[PDB]
Design an enzyme around this catalytic site. Structure first.
Site, PDB file in Angstrom:
ATOM      1  N   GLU A 102      -2.544  -4.956  -6.981  1.00  0.00           N
ATOM      2  CA  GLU A 102      -3.863  -4.680  -6.441  1.00  0.00           C
ATOM      3  C   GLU A 102      -4.642  -5.978  -6.201  1.00  0.00           C
ATOM      4  O   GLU A 102      -5.259  -6.179  -5.139  1.00  0.00           O
ATOM      5  CB  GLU A 102      -4.720  -3.838  -7.424  1.00  0.00           C
ATOM      6  CG  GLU A 102      -4.423  -2.337  -7.588  1.00  0.00           C
ATOM      7  CD  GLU A 102      -4.578  -1.553  -6.301  1.00  0.00           C
ATOM      8  OE1 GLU A 102      -4.889  -2.167  -5.303  1.00  0.00           O
ATOM      9  OE2 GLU A 102      -4.397  -0.338  -6.263  1.00  0.00           O
ATOM     10  N   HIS A 138     -10.119  -1.006  -7.377  1.00  0.00           N
ATOM     11  CA  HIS A 138      -8.849  -0.422  -7.938  1.00  0.00           C
ATOM     12  C   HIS A 138      -8.335  -1.287  -9.068  1.00  0.00           C
ATOM     13  O   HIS A 138      -7.897  -0.796 -10.145  1.00  0.00           O
ATOM     14  CB  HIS A 138      -7.735  -0.277  -6.888  1.00  0.00           C
ATOM     15  CG  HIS A 138      -8.009   0.752  -5.822  1.00  0.00           C
ATOM     16  ND1 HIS A 138      -7.091   1.058  -4.854  1.00  0.00           N
ATOM     17  CD2 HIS A 138      -9.100   1.474  -5.540  1.00  0.00           C
ATOM     18  CE1 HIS A 138      -7.612   1.948  -4.017  1.00  0.00           C
ATOM     19  NE2 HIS A 138      -8.824   2.237  -4.425  1.00  0.00           N
ATOM     20  N   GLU A 167      -9.553  -2.198  -2.842  1.00  0.00           N
ATOM     21  CA  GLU A 167      -8.551  -2.728  -3.754  1.00  0.00           C
ATOM     22  C   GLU A 167      -9.173  -3.464  -4.936  1.00  0.00           C
ATOM     23  O   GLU A 167      -8.644  -3.405  -6.021  1.00  0.00           O
ATOM     24  CB  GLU A 167      -7.554  -3.671  -3.085  1.00  0.00           C
ATOM     25  CG  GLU A 167      -7.061  -3.241  -1.732  1.00  0.00           C
ATOM     26  CD  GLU A 167      -6.167  -2.015  -1.743  1.00  0.00           C
ATOM     27  OE1 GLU A 167      -6.244  -1.194  -2.699  1.00  0.00           O
ATOM     28  OE2 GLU A 167      -5.380  -1.902  -0.776  1.00  0.00           O
ATOM     29  N   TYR A 209      -3.321  -0.202   8.934  1.00  0.00           N
ATOM     30  CA  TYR A 209      -2.480  -1.262   9.460  1.00  0.00           C
ATOM     31  C   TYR A 209      -1.759  -0.795  10.727  1.00  0.00           C
ATOM     32  O   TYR A 209      -1.563  -1.579  11.639  1.00  0.00           O
ATOM     33  CB  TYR A 209      -1.476  -1.793   8.452  1.00  0.00           C
ATOM     34  CG  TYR A 209      -2.103  -2.316   7.197  1.00  0.00           C
ATOM     35  CD1 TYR A 209      -3.087  -3.327   7.255  1.00  0.00           C
ATOM     36  CD2 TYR A 209      -1.686  -1.849   5.963  1.00  0.00           C
ATOM     37  CE1 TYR A 209      -3.657  -3.818   6.098  1.00  0.00           C
ATOM     38  CE2 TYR A 209      -2.241  -2.335   4.814  1.00  0.00           C
ATOM     39  CZ  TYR A 209      -3.203  -3.322   4.895  1.00  0.00           C
ATOM     40  OH  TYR A 209      -3.735  -3.795   3.751  1.00  0.00           O
ATOM     41  N   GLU A 227      -4.917   4.279  -0.854  1.00  0.00           N
ATOM     42  CA  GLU A 227      -3.786   3.393  -0.572  1.00  0.00           C
ATOM     43  C   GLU A 227      -3.046   3.841   0.661  1.00  0.00           C
ATOM     44  O   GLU A 227      -2.411   3.067   1.397  1.00  0.00           O
ATOM     45  CB  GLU A 227      -2.804   3.299  -1.766  1.00  0.00           C
ATOM     46  CG  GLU A 227      -3.353   2.698  -3.042  1.00  0.00           C
ATOM     47  CD  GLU A 227      -3.963   1.335  -2.849  1.00  0.00           C
ATOM     48  OE1 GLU A 227      -5.180   1.270  -2.564  1.00  0.00           O
ATOM     49  OE2 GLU A 227      -3.188   0.359  -2.987  1.00  0.00           O
ATOM     50  N   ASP A 287       0.850  -1.199   0.000  1.00  0.00           N
ATOM     51  CA  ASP A 287       0.000   0.000   0.000  1.00  0.00           C
ATOM     52  C   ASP A 287       0.879   1.240   0.000  1.00  0.00           C
ATOM     53  O   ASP A 287       0.612   2.142  -0.766  1.00  0.00           O
ATOM     54  CB  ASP A 287      -0.927   0.061   1.178  1.00  0.00           C
ATOM     55  CG  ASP A 287      -2.255  -0.579   0.873  1.00  0.00           C
ATOM     56  OD1 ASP A 287      -2.841  -0.312  -0.165  1.00  0.00           O
ATOM     57  OD2 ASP A 287      -2.725  -1.338   1.698  1.00  0.00           O
TER      58      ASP A 287
END
Ligand SMILES: Cc1cc2nc3c(=O)[nH]c(=O)nc-3n(C[C@H](O)[C@H](O)[C@H](O)COP(=O)(O)O)c2cc1C
Ligand SMILES: Cc1cc2nc3c(=O)[nH]c(=O)nc-3n(C[C@H](O)[C@H](O)[C@H](O)COP(=O)(O)O)c2cc1C
Ligand SMILES: [Cl-]
Ligand SMILES: [Cl-]
Ligand SMILES: [Cl-]
Ligand SMILES: [Cl-]
Ligand SMILES: [Cl-]
Ligand SMILES: [Cl-]
Ligand SMILES: [Cl-]
Ligand SMILES: [Cl-]
Ligand SMILES: [Cl-]
Ligand SMILES: [Cl-]
Ligand SMILES: [Fe+2]
Ligand SMILES: [Fe+2]
Lengths: 290, 118, 290, 118
Positions: free
Chosen positions: A161, A198, A195, A100, A93, A62
């Site tokens: 992705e 994406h 994602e 996280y 992203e 990311d």
């Protein structure tokens, strides 16, 4: 010099993706993960290490997609409405990357967390994998780029992705599908939904450019795309053996990697290249439960 | 049986080419005068493409079943276009499959459509 | 290769800017502009033309800042937490650009709107102005960039963010401060609040790099910064005479341009260079009323 | 009079250097034992920096007035840090100014602080 005019459509899809990005917008503050501690402490040390290691890797991908991939691909588009969508996706992203850290600051001490990051930065397969992808992006650091160069950066993108993340996404889903770390799991589910779109979007843009290549360039990028697919699969198998041997999940993760690779290919309008198998049902349950 | 479908990025279209049953991509003016099965893709949050909703307003009487292409990444919203259509028009969900579908999805669909032609 | 770790701060400000960007997030769908028609039709033709022309120009600058400026500046930072904020800011530059289309589709027909965009794309002073700025960004289209190159792209950025937009922002504020087009005005107010913090942020990053330059490079970029400031002021005076002579507002707009130039300089830690005057009070009222 | 201040990006600090009245940048442990005027900057949505709020919890008894640096771009939230502080601790807003302030802002401040030393 052109300004973006949304009252004259440049393609038949950017607006819908623009809108869906925004509809999907979420930030880590929306999901409290404190309640995961109850199940976190019931994991073994080996399970705990695998989870943190995979979150490391997810954060790396990311980081590079927000910091290199979306910026260098978008800077070269002439389609300003598509450029817009890609800028937004690149911001997302970074939203993911930060999400996280939010997980990490419940599951670990500050020292443990910094140790994971040091491990990520020094890890040779991660360096290799991220380096192959980013080399397609850094090729675009020049004023003028060919359609082939741009096409291959877009292939690399969709591979990241839609494919490369999934060796990591496997574990939080797998645990959530067992009712463990379900809060952290819900965050990963939001990430994956972003994602997923994406990957679709960048695959659309790639197919547009493909249609413009000569027959000979088409053959060249088709070959390069198969090579990259398989080079990355080879690295991913090395990575899955490193991370998951300790918890006996190597072949399950490899299967899931193949399943997502095939999805990434289809995002490019290409045929699947790995055997068709159903999704891991526990992973599926991790996707559902909310 | 006749299959009406809608495909945005080519996946539903690829699936229908694996069937060699007769099939047609829907548009605005299209009228279907015979019993048919609808295959739709799924738009954000488990929704039905607008073009499909518009079509179905005019053609729902002969609709015999709906299948959805989606992506299991959407969790409980996986192919929920079929849920919405099934509920609104009281027809069965034939099947849900991902993207351009697997062979098991192709066979499954074929079996279900026979079953439903009963 | 490094992944972004928010549990180890890389500077003392990125987090607050990260958070404030997100707190500020808005999209055009949140502000209905239909009700502006009542005051729109009471404007003269000359007023109407000026408004649309300025919205054109605003849309151009946001297009380039989202599509070139933030991407090329951010790709070269080593500070990943700052990179994150800049990606988000670039997305917001596209949110703004689109918000101008939303205004346009109440104030004009599709044909009028496309005519404005054609006018923008072919307009020589706009080409010139945007081209001077973007030439600092396109210099960064190479693998390795010097601190001086990066510094000057950041100066260009802050000049665009904090200075160049204001010849255009003047008019919607001026009318809103008279109770005309107040819905469109509220949108511009949201835009300006975003841009204001964009300018601060990029000025912070610039000052960091300045502190690292040699005494001789410092002297060089100081000179280059004064040159650019004044080159842009000269173009802006030509632009304000084009747009605003017809409605008798040229010197008022020029004063407002100087007032914002001084703010942009301060964002760089630099001294004001134009005479200190209070803000136009009608413009001030346009900023307040909501 | 003594001026306590907080500056994030250097603007309030530049302003205080135009006063040559004595002034000190606040910190966590700082205690002020004499009558003082606070100059703060303004954080998003017209808010008070956390460092200032923490300081004032311990030092509000001797606070005689507050000025805010902000930016008029924030509309009705321009320097509203001073509004919040004034209300919470019942002291006057001395002045509001933008960024590093103009000369008229410097003179204004000086006059107001005299007036308030009454
Ligand atoms: C913006 C967007 C939103 C989506 N939302 C959903 C969803 O809620 N559920 C789902 O199962 N699939 C969803 N998908 C996946 C598509 O339905 C899937 O890729 C499908 O195969 C597309 O078919 P087509 O290639 O014929 O358009 C979405 C895809 C995109 C691009
Ligand atoms: C994130 C952020 C939010 C801000 N919010 C406000 C606000 O609500 N009202 C205001 O008047 N100024 C606001 N400002 C402007 C600052 O208060 C102004 O630049 C001030 O001069 C900063 O002082 P300093 O340089 O000493 O930190 C904000 C600035 C930033 C960076
Ligand atoms: Cl990066
Ligand atoms: Cl999807
Ligand atoms: Cl194993
Ligand atoms: Cl293929
Ligand atoms: Cl295989
Ligand atoms: Cl651009
Ligand atoms: Cl500001
Ligand atoms: Cl005039
Ligand atoms: Cl200076
Ligand atoms: Cl002057
Ligand atoms: Fe992504
Ligand atoms: Fe901006």
């Amino acid at each position: 010099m052109r300004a973006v005019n949304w009252n004259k459509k440049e393609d038949d899809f950017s607006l819908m993706f623009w809108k869906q990005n925004i509809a999907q917008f979420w930030t880590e503050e929306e999901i409290a993960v404190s309640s995961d501690k109850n199940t976190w402490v019931q994991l073994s040390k080996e399970e705990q290490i695998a989870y943190k290691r995979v979150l490391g890797g997810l954060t790396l991908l990311d980081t590079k997609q927000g910091g290199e991939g979306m910026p260098l691909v978008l800077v070269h588009l002439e389609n300003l409405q598509a450029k817009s969508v890609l800028a937004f996706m690149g911001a997302m992203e970074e939203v993911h990357a930060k999400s996280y850290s939010h997980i990490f600051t419940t599951l670990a001490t500050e020292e443990e967390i910094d140790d994971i990051f040091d491990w990520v930065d020094n890890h040779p397969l991660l360096e290799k994998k991220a380096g192959i992808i980013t080399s397609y992006y850094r090729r675009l650091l020049k004023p003028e780029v060919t359609k082939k160069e741009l096409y291959m950066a877009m292939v690399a993108s969709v591979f990241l992705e839609s494919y490369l993340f999934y060796s990591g996404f496997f574990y939080p889903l797998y645990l959530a599908g067992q009712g463990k770390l379900t809060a952290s799991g819900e965050i990963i589910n939001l990430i994956i939904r972003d994602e997923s779109i994406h990957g679709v979007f960048v695959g659309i843009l790639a197919q547009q450019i493909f249609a413009e290549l000569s027959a000979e360039e088409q053959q060249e990028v088709q070959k390069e795309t198969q090579e990259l697919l398989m080079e990355l699969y080879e690295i991913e198998m090395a990575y899955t053996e490193e991370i998951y041997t300790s918890i006996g999940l190597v072949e399950d993760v490899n299967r899931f990697v193949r399943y997502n690779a095939n999805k990434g290919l289809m995002n490019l309008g290409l045929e699947p290249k790995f055997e068709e198998e159903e999704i891991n049902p526990i992973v599926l349950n991790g996707l559902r439960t909310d | 049986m006749l299959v009406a479908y809608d495909s945005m990025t080519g996946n539903v279209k690829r699936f229908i080419h694996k069937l060699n049953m007769p099939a047609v991509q829907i548009d605005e003016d299209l009228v279907i005068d015979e019993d048919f099965i609808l295959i739709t893709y799924t738009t954000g949050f488990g929704n039905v493409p607008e073009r499909v909703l518009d079509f179905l307003e005019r053609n729902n009487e002969k609709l015999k079943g709906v299948s959805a292409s989606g992506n299991r990444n959407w969790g409980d919203m996986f192919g929920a276009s079929a849920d919405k259509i099934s509920t609104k028009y009281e027809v069965p969900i034939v099947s849900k499959f991902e993207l351009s579908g697997t062979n098991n999805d192709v066979e499954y669909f074929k079996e279900r459509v026979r079953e439903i032609a009963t």
